[PDB]
Amino acid sequence: HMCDAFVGTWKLVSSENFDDYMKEVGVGFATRKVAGMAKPNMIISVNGDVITIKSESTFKNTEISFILGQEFDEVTADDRKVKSTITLDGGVLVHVQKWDGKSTTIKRKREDDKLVVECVMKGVTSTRVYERA
Numbered sequence: 132h133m134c135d136a137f138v139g140t141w142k143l144v145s146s147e148n149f150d151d152y153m154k155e156v157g158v159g160f161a162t163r164k165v166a167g168m169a170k171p172n173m174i175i176s177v178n179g180d181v182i183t184i185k186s187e188s189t190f191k192n193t194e195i196s197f198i199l200g201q202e203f204d205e206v207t208a209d210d211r212k213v214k215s216t217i218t219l220d221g222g223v224l225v226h227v228q229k230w231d232g233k234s235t236t237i238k239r240k241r242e243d244d245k246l247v248v249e250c251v252m253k254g255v256t257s258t259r260v261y262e263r264a
C-alpha cells in the first residue's frame with residue numbers, strides 16, 4: 132500500500148514560477164515556452180514494489196518506473212540525461228536528478244485533495260498543484 136494516496140490520475144490546476152525553475156535548470160527558450168503552456172496529467176500507479184509515474188500533455192508524454200531507493204537513468208522532457216533516485220521521506224516522494232555536476236529535487240506530496248509538486252534548482256522553487264481528474 133506504499134503510495135496509495137498518490138495513485139490515480141491527476142490534472143494540473145496551477146503553476147507558479149515554472150519558467151524561472153526551467154531557466155535555472157538550463158532549459159532553452161523554445162522548450163520553456165511550449166513546456167510552460169502544457170497542462171499535463173500525471174498518472175501514478177503501483178504494482179508490487181514498482182511505482183510508475185506518467186506525464187501526458189500536448190508537449191510530451193513521459194513515463195518512469197522505479198523502485199524506491201534504487202537509482203535509474205531518466206531522459207527528462209527537456210532531453211536531459213539524468214541519474215535519478217526516488218525515496219519516500221515522511222510521506223513525501225523525493226526525486227533527485229543528477230547530471231553534469233548539477234542536481235535538482237522534485238517533491239510530490241498529498242495536501243488536502245491536491246497533489247503538490249515542488250521543483251527546486253538552487254534557490255529557485257516552482258510549485259505545481261494537481262487535482263484528481
Ligand SMILES: O=C(OCc1ccc(Cl)cc1)c1[nH]c(=O)[nH]c(=O)c1F
Pocket residue numbers: 153158162166173184186207208209237248250259
Ligand atoms: O518539474 C518536473 O519535471 C522536471 C522538469 C521540468 C520541466 C521540464 Cl521541460 C522537464 C522536466 C515535474 N515532474 C512532475 O511529476 N510533475 C510536474 O508538474 C513537474 F513539473
